[PDB]
Symmetry: D2
Subunit: 347 residues, 4 copies
């Protein structure tokens, strides 16, 4: 007794859901996707990410629980599988006086300490230090492809205009029993879905060779509500990602030079160890610039079943700026919605 599943999409959400589904021997799985790991394109968010684990959800929220559920998997991969491109990094988070002390992730993440009042920079209300992970997305996304392959997942280049078409793309040559929709921001335009609550949150990055040795971030800036500051160093020499930008309803794919300059200035002033004692922006050794669009949904991630044109579909999209840090938690819930959808299909 087998189930033909097409996972539509090959970003974090598609790859993590396909991998977890593949652990069930009754699932025969095709990952069908327009863009694959190795691709850089504005329609494909996953490779643009930093990425790190830095919870943004409230303790009792859906997102918060998803973040909480994801950590043990990411820690497991970081501890046991150096081939996956995940490493542990010391992390500092600064919260400005113009604004949260002792967050829930303090009980979860290793080496959590709250910094003393005399250790705080001017303008900072509270700060904390802890161990978390930075994901080298360029190594990790193909690692997930690889893990899916070991469990017999077949990958296939495809483009669909409507979600129900994905059910005709299963490698068996037979109709899929279920389609899992991990199209992210493309679910805004995809037929049978057309989710109007989706919006891009544009994110510009500068990729640099300089290794500061820790992840840094501040709660806000004085450059505007949509210009943020963070940095993280990717595992396995992948480079340092300097950010950033959070521009809702902005679709612009091309790095803006002014914005790039301001990210770099904000970064070298937040964590000066990026550069030598005397230096400004010129001591950064830039690899490239980049821009992705965060698939922000009004109510956050949509993980639910829907019978669409006589095809059972389990959605798993709308992960905004937290798709990696919710990935395993979200994929797990999706695995259960798939089970539930097939259980209704069986009877």
């Amino acid at each position: 007794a087998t189930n033909n599943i097409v996972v539509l999409g090959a970003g974090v959400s598609g790859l993590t859901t396909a991998w977890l589904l593949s652990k069930d021997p009754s699932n025969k799985i095709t990952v069908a996707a327009k863009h694959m790991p190795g691709d850089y394109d504005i329609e494909y968010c996953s490779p643009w990410a930093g990425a790190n684990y830095l919870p943004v959800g409230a303790e009792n929220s859906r997102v918060g629980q998803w973040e909480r559920a994801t950590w043990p998997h990411l820690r497991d991969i970081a501890q046991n599988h150096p081939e996956a491109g995940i490493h542990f990094q010391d992390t500092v988070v600064y919260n400005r006086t113009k604004d949260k002390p002792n967050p829930w992730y303090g009980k979860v993440l290793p080496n959590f300490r709250e910094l003393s009042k005399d250790e705080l920079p001017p303008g900072i209300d509270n700060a904390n230090r802890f161990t978390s992970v930075c994901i080298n997305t360029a190594v990790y996304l193909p690692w997930l492809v690889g893990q899916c392959r070991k469990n017999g997942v077949v990958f296939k280049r495809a483009v669909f205009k409507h979600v129900a078409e994905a059910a005709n793309a299963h490698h068996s040559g037979q109709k899929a029993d279920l389609v899992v929709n991990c199209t992210g921001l493309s679910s805004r335009k995809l037929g049978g879905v057309q989710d109007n609550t989706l919006l891009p949150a544009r994110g510009q990055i500068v990729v640099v060779r300089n290794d500061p040795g820790l992840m840094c971030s501040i709660s806000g800036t004085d450059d505007g509500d949509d210009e943020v500051t963070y940095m993280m160093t990717r595992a396995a020499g992948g480079g340092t990602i300097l950010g950033g930008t959070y521009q809702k309803h902005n679709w612009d794919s091309l790095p803006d030079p002014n914005l790039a300059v301001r990210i770099m200035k904000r970064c070298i002033e937040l964590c000066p160890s990026l550069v030598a004692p005397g230096q400004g922006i010129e001591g950064l050794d830039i690899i490239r610039h980049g821009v992705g669009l965060r698939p922000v949904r009004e109510d956050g991630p949509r993980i639910e079943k829907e019978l669409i044109d006589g095809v059972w579909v389990v959605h798993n999209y709308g992960h905004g700026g937290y798709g990696y840090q919710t990935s395993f938690g979200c994929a797990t819930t999706a695995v259960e919605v798939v089970r539930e959808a097939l259980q209704q299909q069986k009877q």
Copy 2:
């Protein structure tokens, strides 16, 4: 214990670092300007198809390196699907403008009879070779190095000797292996005047034709070729191509792209649905790399430069993946030789 900096993180660098990492007396840093995940004109490896299609003559250095590399690639395609290499049926058509040595090497080798060969075609070979999804394989190689304790660092060097100061131990490296490819033309203390780019333009499509096919030449020009190959694990199909010596142009030419796409659908029509032309190709993107061609082929040899022992492994032209393990095995041999003198 030997503090080795591998300068470079393309196929040559990664494959050599991996073979070196098998020796526990080696402490290995990979230091490089560009890493897997990067697309840049200075970084050839991501631009490759890539496949195994020998170009060296039987008893040439290149030929023996190609011969030595096959069992490594076969084993990876057989036993490690996570690496992004799979077996593919291959066709090689030879025009007018037979029994090649790889016929005794590659599985399922047959030569085509004249009743099967189209007009203007002299002879053809059919066989099983491999296609490498380089987007998966390059990071896989990073991962295998990582699993063996290899440390990866982002670095830029003006001079080859500087790499000896980038070792992750903090101590001065005993040896630097120069795996900088085409950058060894300008690299301090190497400055190799016999290196030239052979520009290669590609078209990346979603269409899976089920096989690799290539021809010995085209009517579109001396420097224009036809090949296609489908990458493993849904990596896409690579349509080629171009071999343009002393051409450094990083940008895809729209005219060359259309010609690539025209020649490919004519060579192997199963790329497209019956009666479709170029519009039938679902195009992912275009691409351009520069092959690091060297006149005397790959340079693998030891040299004392500014106190630092240097073993070069560069100048692999269009055949860096298909000589990777073979060249890296020679590099290891020369590394042990240079360390014994030390």
Copy 3:
């Protein structure tokens, strides 16, 4: 009773901004600064004008505002084509096909050498076809030519970026606060402070620029390749190259040319007017220069030309020209001049 002066800032340097600047400059009473983020010679998705074909081929209903602006614009364009070859406009023979899937249009009484194509001559699946002489603008010559025409009349051009329309009033070259600002920011009026026009939307248009000169302009009213895909061609004056189109994708901001869209544009164009290539050739006979994508500044109510007081500054809008900014330019610029003269009456 001193020399009467009006300090005007024209905000924007695309066709709307430039044509309106030029018309205002012919009044010696006006002292004019053109302040703009992008200028002729720049390529950017925020700047629609250099992406245009561009031709004259009316889309407005006879008695509609757009239609009347189109009619008013032809004389100016024809005169420039007639008398000023330096401007990069030339006349070209033009054919339009109206398919059976979708007859004596008003421009038949305006444009020279017009004819209805016969019952015998209409190709399969076409209800009506018309041939006529119109104009093709080499935008890469014409936009800088308009800059030059403004400069002759002492218009000062200044690079500037504003978050709010009122800030343009502080950008006048005289050092004094502007009396009026002309808002010609096209699609950027969606986001610009004090304007925030939610009725603006992009209509993405992708082109292929080629070397091949068919010696005529030709379009069709629709295609088999979807509602958002169209077919046209025009050859720019003065060796400017041939523009192959196209695409009309509402609510699509994508700045990058899609290679599949490019191939289909070229396939359709090869079909519609075969003398692009030497017969026996397909797409490979085209000598491609480059690909290009622009976003047409579509407004639901068409072009906004009205006076508004935003903060202390009188503002005259002239934006929302969609895919017809060149063929309405002089018509629209004339109305704005009159609205400016209206607001200055105080």
Copy 4:
């Protein structure tokens, strides 16, 4: 009627076409791959600043051409504002870390800076008025001038120079081809000039108007990096430079080089930004890279019978194609006229 094909539409071709067009016995086709409005690394002209800042020795071919060029540029700036040429105040700083030039006798209000006027680390400095060309207005303006005189323009790619003689708008084989292909003369058939080489120049285009052209003799960032700025006429933007990299063909702007251009420029002339601002004070339009067509012997202006066609070359202008444009064009016309007999 002399049927002339001018092969190429950068400064060399356009200026030469315009000069030849003033003789009514010439029927001229400008045939070119790339035309004004295009951006491509095979097309050098739109990547230029451009300004007049002579580099040739007093009695050299180049310096003579620079000298003869000035009055043409001065005149266009004086009487023809529509052409996008700008009079600009100019300062040239010579570092002590790295002399009364001949152009002191050519350019208006030239004066050496006094001892009190020299900044720290500066040996001597020259102040004068020169010209900045808005290449984006001026190139199309030249096309327009050619058009007014009956020059017809044709998009065309040729693999061999002699083929250009078949592209004449009359339909008859051209009496003469003018080779104005710049760096493309290295690969173009019948020419294949191996003394050509690229000198790569990266620029930053900014909105900030400093009010003057600033230039310095050298850098602390290595020989192949330079420092200059110039503001284009008619709101064309300010061009920040730069680099001079022999044999580098690279078309992509390198971000580290860009950052260093911007720092050197705000340090050379701080009125680019406001006091307190660094590189964030610069309002960037875009980055760009062109390849100067450097030739060993400088510009090649001579007749050559290639196949059955008379070819007058005018290429290899390096970083001085604009400031020698008219000088060189005039000589080419003389060479053309002779070749017709």
